[PDB]
Amino acid sequence: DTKEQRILRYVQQNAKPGDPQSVLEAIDTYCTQKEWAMNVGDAKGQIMDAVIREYSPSLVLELGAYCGYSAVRMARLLQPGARLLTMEMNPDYAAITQQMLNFAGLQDKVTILNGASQDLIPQLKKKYDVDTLDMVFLDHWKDRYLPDTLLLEKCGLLRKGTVLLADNVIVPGTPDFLAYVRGSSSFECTHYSSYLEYMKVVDGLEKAIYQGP
Ligand SMILES: Cc1ncnc2c1ncn2[C@@H]1O[C@H](/C=C/CNC(=O)c2cc(-c3ccc(F)cc3)cc(O)c2O)[C@@H](O)[C@H]1O
Ligand SMILES: [Cl-]
Ligand SMILES: [Cl-]
Ligand SMILES: [Cl-]
Ligand SMILES: [Cl-]
Ligand SMILES: [Mg+2]
């Protein structure tokens, strides 16, 4: 089997069903002790939690679910009735994420869309009845951060106050996105220095709050 299947199996055998905190702990233990994986991790995860708690977003979009770690992290802090949509183009990973969410008992709060973000984002308004997004977590291919930001704005999915939170702005890095949001009068940006998941390597998150056109 694959690393991702091993992680799902480990969660299933080392966490309590319906207990998201135990699911996160199990994944963090697996990835620290057994096999590294590109989950946001606990160091950056704590920053994410602090952000989610500040803004209490009613609708969050996540680009790049992977195994569902960040989806569990975010969805567990959502208020009753609040929703997370997560896009994942790799069907194998989309299946892992759905199963991870089911195990955590968060399946009613999250929808996992199996496709490419550039194909699905234009469908959000008409097919998924989205008006605007309250928050967007960017954690997919790093060269897609800027193009999907620009696509979200073209699609009318951003509103004044929409929070963009971007992983890996240092490693692997997202130089074009970072330069763009920091230079644009349409974003107010904050850098949160942290560490690469499960590693003593500097990384960080960038928060970019959309200010309108
Ligand atoms: C257009 C589109 N649409 C839908 N899903 C999409 C999508 N593009 C990608 N995806 C999905 O998102 C995930 C992939 C995320 C890419 N993340 C990283 O590559 C990543 C890498 C590291 C890393 C750091 C140091 C290293 F030495 C090696 C790797 C750390 C990270 O935290 C990363 O996130 C993966 O699940 C992929 O299918
Ligand atoms: Cl993750
Ligand atoms: Cl990438
Ligand atoms: Cl700024
Ligand atoms: Cl960590
Ligand atoms: Mg990442």
Phi, psi of 108 (to 5 degrees): -75, -20
Other CB atoms within 10 Å distance of the CB of residue 164: 24
Rounded distance, CA 54 to CA 199, Å? 27
Q: Name the closest-CA residue to atom 30, ligand 1.
A: 38
- Judge contact between 211 and 202, C-beta under 8 A: no
Other Cβ atoms less than 10 A from the Cβ of 17: the count is 12
Asked how this structure was determined, the answer is X-ray
Question: The sheet that has 187-195: what strands, in order across it?
Answer: 110-113, 83-87, 59-63, 135-138, 163-166, 202-210, 187-195
The values of phi and psi at residue 206, to 5°, are: -110, 130
Query: How many separate domains does the chain show?
Result: 1
Tell whether 4 is in a known binding site. no
CATH code of the domain in which 156 resides: 3.40.50.150
Tokens (6 digits) for 127: 């097919």
Locate the ligand 1 atom nearest the alpha carbon of residue 118 and give its number.
Answer: 1
Resolution for the entry shown, Å: 1.6
Q: Indicate the top mutation candidate among 141, 149, 197 to test ligand 1's pocket, ranked by most ligand atoms within 8 A of CB.
A: 141
CA–CA dist 183, 56 (Å, integer):
27
Range of the domain at 9: 1-213
The answer to the question of whether 199 is labelled as a binding residue is no
User: One-letter amino acid identity for 19?
Assistant: D
